[PDB]
Design a protein around this ligand. Structure first.
Ligand SMILES: COC(=O)c1cc(S(N)(=O)=O)c(SC2CCCCC2)cc1Cl
Ligand SMILES: COC(=O)c1cc(S(N)(=O)=O)c(SC2CCCCC2)cc1Cl
Ligand SMILES: [Zn+2]
Ligand SMILES: [Zn+2]
Lengths: 260, 260
């Protein structure tokens, strides 16, 4: 067990999950002193992101976030290996502090953050097996700003009702997962990092898009109030809020950018 | 052992120093949504700060920071008890990322931060004994930005060459410690917090002056490049940089200000 508040919190994670006190931890603050323009950061290709609205995909409350299972037929081109999707999920704040992005920009949090998680399908059979192995993982991060209502993000959020408690699951219609992406996906930050959650394996090629997407106040209120870390029948219920890790030390790293 | 990098780093502190995973952890980000003017916050007076240039004071590289031992008749007046000085030390970044303050203001890191550590001499013989006791410690924090040359900070930085390596020690003629303080010391943030290093005891009444001081990039650079964490004869020498804790989560809690 582990949480984002009090004894079992992120300062305690290392007690049980040693890579949590290891090198190359995410997330981090994106600021100009540690950015490095790199001409080898070519645009990524989003293959098989257009999911049929006639097909269903599983939304799950895992106690930590809400996650949507993705088919491995969907993948990234543009990296050293093929990276097949496994799932997406979100991190957010709370009604009183709607600033729960993991990555910050110049010390500022965004409202929230979407993570699209892929595994190295050329080396490993599944995300689990890739999880603690070199070149195992590749996450796309999308910074989320409070703004206009997002009909595309709502294809996830209109179902939060059915996954209020840890272990609950609802089938959700396919949609074009590229609609979750901001503009100029060719402008991104790139760096070597980790799971932002235990076991914090240092096995993740991070790609954080430069531009944020927008979701409304109401969407954030809904995401910040819908969900519990706890089973429906737990007598110590904990609201699923502030499910974000503090930015980490750079350990001599740079953040390579596709823009200058 | 404990460091600010690698296996023994701040995320691992909780293993041997459980308070580092506990309550009231410092440092924090000071942002308006958690600031409340409290009109009761009157100026502190600093008694005995004017150390005679007649008298010499020990400067130690302890492998975490440069530290200047201060005399105990040096003290804060204005608190609920008398708080006597034990030492001052600094935190800083690295030449490539010169943002090494512990506290941040609206997510911004300052160049460096000076801590003048006082203990409750009314109740406790020394700061060591005070350190795990309720209301044992009061620290004064000064935020440092790059700007004009600072002749009074130079009274410390002039001697850094005598304490390059860990365990090294130099005598510094006394000066007025009150010259290390910024403009309008009446303007400060006040909260209940912890030590920012192990054992992270939640025993510290924090006072962080509103206004930064300036030191020249030459002053700042000397500090960033002058010292090593390692003994003279350590075959693998480690530069002393980034000796600052990541800001902690600050939940359902307020920072008071003496300014509206
Ligand atoms: C609130 O945080 C999360 O719940 C979460 C966060 C991540 S993250 N932010 O990408 O590190 C992953 S990815 C990982 C899960 C375990 C095995 C490999 C895939 C999965 C999850 Cl389920
Ligand atoms: C770079 O960090 C340090 O070197 C440091 C930083 C602090 S701080 N930031 O004030 O917690 C203390 S506190 C001192 C109080 C007396 C007994 C324990 C150590 C001691 C030290 Cl040794
Ligand atoms: Zn995530
Ligand atoms: Zn300190």
């Amino acid at each position: 067990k582990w949480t984002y508040f009090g004894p079992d919190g992120e300062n305690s994670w290392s007690k049980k999950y040693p890579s949590c006190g290891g090198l190359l931890q995410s997330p981090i603050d994106l600021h100009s002193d540690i950015l490095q323009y790199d001409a080898s950061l070519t645009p990524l290709e989003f293959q098989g992101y257009n999911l049929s609205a006639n097909k269903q995909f599983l939304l799950t409350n895992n106690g930590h976030s809400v996650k949507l299972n993705l088919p491995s037929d969907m993948h990234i081109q543009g990296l050293q290996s093929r990276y097949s999707a496994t799932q997406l999920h979100l991190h957010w704040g709370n009604p009183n502090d709607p600033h729960g992005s993991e990555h910050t920009v110049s010390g500022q949090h965004f409202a929230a953050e979407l993570h699209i998680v892929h595994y190295n399908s050329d080396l490993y059979p599944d995300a689990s097996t890739a999880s603690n192995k070199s070149e195992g993982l590749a996450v796309l991060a999308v910074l989320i700003e409070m703004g206009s209502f997002n009909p595309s993000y709502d294809k996830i959020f209109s179902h939060l009702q059915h996954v209020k408690y840890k272990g609950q699951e609802a089938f959700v219609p396919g949609f074009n997962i590229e609609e979750l992406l901001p503009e100029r996906t060719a402008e991104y930050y790139r760096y070597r990092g980790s799971l932002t959650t235990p076991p914090c394996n240092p096995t993740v090629l991070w790609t954080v898009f430069r531009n944020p997407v927008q979701i409304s106040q109401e969407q954030l209120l809904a995401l910040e109030t819908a969900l519990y870390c706890t089973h429906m029948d737990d007598p110590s219920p904990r609201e699923m809020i502030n499910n974000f890790r503090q930015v980490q030390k750079f350990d001599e790293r740079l953040v390579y950018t596709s823009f200058s």
